[PDB]
Design a protein around this ligand. Structure first.
Ligand SMILES: CO[C@H]1O[C@H](CO[C@H]2O[C@H](CO)[C@@H](O)[C@H](O)[C@@H]2O)[C@@H](O)[C@H](O[C@H]2O[C@H](CO)[C@@H](O)[C@H](O)[C@@H]2O)[C@@H]1O
Ligand SMILES: CO[C@H]1O[C@H](CO[C@H]2O[C@H](CO)[C@@H](O)[C@H](O)[C@@H]2O)[C@@H](O)[C@H](O[C@H]2O[C@H](CO)[C@@H](O)[C@H](O)[C@@H]2O)[C@@H]1O
Ligand SMILES: CO[C@H]1O[C@H](CO[C@H]2O[C@H](CO)[C@@H](O)[C@H](O)[C@@H]2O)[C@@H](O)[C@H](O[C@H]2O[C@H](CO)[C@@H](O)[C@H](O)[C@@H]2O)[C@@H]1O
Ligand SMILES: CO[C@H]1O[C@H](CO[C@H]2O[C@H](CO)[C@@H](O)[C@H](O)[C@@H]2O)[C@@H](O)[C@H](O[C@H]2O[C@H](CO)[C@@H](O)[C@H](O)[C@@H]2O)[C@@H]1O
Ligand SMILES: [Ca+2]
Ligand SMILES: [Ca+2]
Ligand SMILES: [Ca+2]
Ligand SMILES: [Ca+2]
Ligand SMILES: [Mn+2]
Ligand SMILES: [Mn+2]
Ligand SMILES: [Mn+2]
Ligand SMILES: [Mn+2]
Lengths: 231, 231, 231, 231
C-alpha cells in the first residue's frame, strides 16, 4: 500500500495495539506501532505547537510538542529516509476519531525542504475556503474559521466520532536524491485538540508518503488515517 | 482562453505584430503585443539572468535582464494584477522557435510569493530527469544535462525550429486575495540562448496564468507559447 | 550632520513646519518636511502595522500603514538611494513626544536587505531586557513587557512628554554598491500608539542613516529624533 | 579567556597535542583537542564546502565537509550549548599557518539562527574591500579578489607561514535563551586551501565565541587562532 513516515500525537492509548498507557507522541516508520514514543501531557482545549525536523547528516527524525508555560515532550528516532521513502513524496497532516472524539483543528502549518541547492517552502498562517494548494481527503475542511479541521466538527463546534481527514500539500517534494550532500526538511503546525468527553481520541499526525497516498479504508480511530491495519 | 501575464525576452523582432526593430524585453498583459518594452542586447551563447518582481504596494511589475560584465535591460509596467489575473494561478517558463531557432535552456529558476501571512517558495538550482513538481508541456524536457530545455534540442546540441515548450510549477499559487495588505512575488531564472544562425528566435518568457493553462495550438514562433493569436 | 531617509508616522500635524492638517505618513529625504505624505487615520490604543519597501529596479520607496479591519494609508516616493545615502548605513526605529504624548511601543520589527548575492535579515518578534544586537539611544528601553519602548513610559504605563528614543540594528547594512543589478530592502514593525490626552504626539519612524548616526540634540517633538531642525 | 565552540578543518596533524595521524575535521568544545574527529581527505587546490548545523531538539552539533565528485567527511558531537556558551555570542571563521603553510581563502559564507520567534540570517556570496559588517582580526583581509583571505597571501598568490586571521559577523547573535522551545543555527562556507609545499598547515574553522573574543596571542599554527594553549 502506501509508504508512511509520520510523527503522531496520539491522544488515546490503545494498549492492545502496542500503545503505552498514556497520551504520547511517537515516530512511526511504516507502522502505527511507534518505533519510539514519549509521554505527552495533552492539554484539552489549549493550542499546542509541534516542530519536526530531519537532516541527512544525522539521519535522525525529531519532534517536539509543546504548550505555552508547560514542559515539552520530545521524541527522536534514528532513520535513514532514503531506505524508507521514495525520492518524491507528498507531505501532510492527518487525524481521526473513533468511539471517543476531539477536535483536530490545525491553526497553521509550514514546511521547508532542501536538497543540496533546491528548495521548497510553504506557510499557512491561515486557511481559506478553497485552499487550492491543499489536497483535502476524508472529512478535512478549510475555511472553517480560517482554520483547517481534519475531522468532522458540527455547527455547534462539537467533534464527531468515527471521523478521518487529511490534508496534503499539492506539490510533490523531492525528499532525497543520492547526488545530494545534505537533504533536510522541517515542519511546524499549531493545533487545537478539544474534547467534551473524559477521554479524547484519537490524534493528529504529520506524515510523509508516496505521492499518490490516500486514506486507507477504515483507518478511523487508532489508525490515525495513516495505516490499513495495526501491524 | 487563458489569462496571461508574462515578461518576455523576445530575441526576434516581429515588426509586423508590433515589435520594436531589435531584441527586447517586454511586459505582456493578456496580449503578445507588449504593454511596455525595452531594448535588449541579447548575447548569443552566454548565460543570462532575469529578475522579475511585483508588489501590491506599488502595483508595478518590473523585470531586469543581465549578462555578466554587461549593462542590463529593465522594463516596468504599472498594473493591478487583481483586475487582470484570478486569485489562484500557476507560474512557469515558456519558449518557442520558428523559422529561426536558438536553444532556450533554463539552468535554474526560483520563485517566492507572499500574501500578507502565507508564503510559497521554490528553487531549482538544477533539474532532474523526472522533476515531479514541474508540469512540462510541449517540447520541454528535464534532465537534459541537469538543465530544463524549453524547446527541442537534438543530440548534437542543436536547436530545432518550430518548437514550443513550457514548464509550470506543480502547485497553484494564491496570487491575490482582497483581505491582504501586501501581496507580492518575484522570480529568477538563468538561461542560455544560443543559436547557430545569424538571427535567433524566438524567445523565453516567465508567465502567470489561470491554473489550467496549456500551450495554445500553433503558438510556436512569435506567440512564445503564450497566446493563440497576435492580438 | 547625519544623512537621513525615513518613513514617518506623524501623529501630530505641525502645520507651521509644513505638515498637513491631519495625522499622516510621509517619506522624508534628508528633511523632516516630507517629500510626499498621505493622510493617516491613526487609531489610539490599537496595534498597527507598517510595511516599507524599496528596490533598485523601480527606485521607489513605499510604505503602507494599517490596522486590522480598517483601510490602510500608503505613500510612495521616487528616489534613487545611491545618490542620497552612503553605501553602508544602519537601520532603525525612532520616536518622540513634545507637549503632547503617546506611547511609542514597538511590539516587533523585521528587516531584509539584498545586494545582488549578499543578504541580511533579522526579526524581533519580541525584545529582551538586554537586546545586545540593538543599539538603543535616548529614552528607548527593551524588556519593557518583551516590547521596545522608544520613548519614556512611567510605571503606571503612561507616556511622558518631551521624550526621544531610537533603536538601531547593531550591524551596518550594505545598502548599495554599483556592481549590483538589484539592491533592495523591506522592513516591518507593529506598534502601539496610545495617548491619554486628546491630541497624541509626535510619531514613529523607520529610518536609514549613516552608520554613526545619533539623536540630534533637542530633536524631541516634531523632529521625531531624526533631524536637527525643521528645514 | 574566551569560550570557544568551533568546527575545525585541520589540514596538519599534531599528534603531540592529541591529533590523529591525518588531516581531519573535528568538533572543539573549549579545547583545541577535538571532542570528536573524522578523517578528512583534503584536496589541495580545490574549492571545498562545509555545512555546520545544531538544533536544540537533538542538541547535536554536526558538520559535513565535501569537495565535488568526492566523498564527504562528517563529524557529530552531542553537546548542549546552553551549558557551554553564553546567551549572546559572535560567530566567525578563523585560520592559521605555522612552519608549514597553505592559502585559507573563503569564497563565501552564510549563517542563520533562530530562537523560537526571532531570527538572524546573513549571506556573503562575495566580499568587498571594506566589508563593514565583518570584524576582521589578525591577517584577515577582504576585497582580495572579492574573497576573504584569513591568513597572509603575497601578491604572487603565495601563502605566508606563521599567519593568523579571523573574521566575525558584526552583530551579536542570541544563541540561546531558556524561554525558547527550539534554538538552532547553521552555517556554510566554501573555501580554497592551496599549498605549494608537501605538508600544508594549519587549517580553517567556524567558531562561536563570547561577543568580545579576539585572537589569543601566539595562536598561529596548531592553535588555529582559537585557543591560547593546547589544553
Ligand atoms: C471493544 O473495545 C475495543 O474498542 C474500543 C473502542 O474502539 C474504537 O474507539 C476507540 C476510542 O474512540 C478508538 O481508539 C479505536 O480505534 C476504535 O475506533 C476501545 O476503547 C477498546 O480499547 C480499550 O480497551 C483496550 C483493551 O481491550 C485498551 O488497550 C485500550 O487502551 C482501551 O482501554 C478496544 O479497542
Ligand atoms: C515571410 O516572412 C514572414 O515570416 C518569416 C518567418 O516567420 C516564422 O519564423 C519567425 C522567426 O522564427 C517566427 O517569429 C514567425 O512567427 C514564423 O514562425 C519572418 O521571419 C518574417 O518576419 C520578418 O519580416 C517582417 C516583415 O518585414 C518583419 O515585420 C519582421 O520584423 C521580420 O523582419 C515574416 O513574419
Ligand atoms: C503654539 O505653540 C507652538 O508649540 C506647541 C508645542 O510644541 C511642542 O509640542 C508639540 C506637540 O507635542 C510638538 O510637535 C512640538 O515639536 C513641540 O515639542 C505646539 O503645540 C503648537 O503647534 C500647534 O499650533 C501651531 C500653530 O497654531 C500649528 O501649526 C500646529 O499644527 C499645532 O496646532 C505650536 O507650534
Ligand atoms: C620542533 O617541532 C615541533 O614544532 C614543529 C613545527 O611547529 C610549527 O609548525 C606546525 C605546522 O606548521 C604548527 O602546527 C605548529 O603550531 C608550529 O607552528 C612540528 O613540526 C613538530 O611536530 C612534530 O611532531 C608531531 C607529532 O605529533 C607531528 O605531528 C609533526 O608532523 C612533527 O613530526 C613539533 O610540534
Ligand atoms: Ca492510540
Ligand atoms: Ca518576437
Ligand atoms: Ca508632526
Ligand atoms: Ca593540527
Ligand atoms: Mn500510538
Ligand atoms: Mn515582443
Ligand atoms: Mn509630518
Ligand atoms: Mn585537530
Amino acid at each position: 500500500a502506501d509508504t508512511i513516515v509520520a510523527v503522531e500525537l496520539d491522544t488515546y492509548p490503545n494498549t492492545d495495539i502496542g500503545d503505552p498507557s498514556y497520551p504520547h507522541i511517537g515516530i512511526d516508520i511504516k507502522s502505527v506501532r511507534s518505533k519510539k514514543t514519549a509521554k505527552w501531557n495533552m492539554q484539552n482545549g489549549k493550542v499546542g505547537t509541534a516542530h519536526i525536523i530531519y537532516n541527512s547528516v544525522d539521519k535522525r527524525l525529531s519532534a517536539v510538542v509543546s504548550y505555552p508555560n508547560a514542559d515539552s515532550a520530545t521524541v527522536s528516532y534514528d532513520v535513514d529516509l532514503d531506505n524508507v521513502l521514495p525520492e518524491w513524496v507528498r507531505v501532510g497532516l492527518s487525524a481521526s476519531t473513533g468511539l471517543y472524539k476531539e477536535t483536530n483543528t490545525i491553526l497553521s502549518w509550514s514546511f521547508t525542504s532542501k536538497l543540496k541547492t533546491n528548495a521548497l517552502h510553504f506557510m499557512f498562517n491561515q486557511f481559506s475556503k478553497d485552499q487550492k494548494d491543499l489536497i483535502l481527503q476524508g472529512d478535512a475542511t478549510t475555511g472553517t474559521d480560517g482554520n483547517l479541521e481534519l475531522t468532522r466538527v458540527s455547527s455547534n463546534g462539537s467533534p464527531q466520532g468515527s471521523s478521518v481527514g487529511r490534508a496534503l500539500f499539492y506539490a510533490p517534494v523531492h525528499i532525497w536524491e543520492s547526488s545530494a550532500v545534505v537533504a533536510s526538511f522541517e515542519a511546524t503546525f499549531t493545533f487545537l485538540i478539544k474534547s467534551p468527553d473524559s477521554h479524547p481520541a484519537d490524534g493528529i499526525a504529520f506524515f510523509i508518503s508516496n505521492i499518490d497516498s490516500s486514506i486507507p479504508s477504515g483507518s478511523t480511530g487508532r489508525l490515525l488515517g495513516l495505516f490499513p491495519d495495526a501491524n
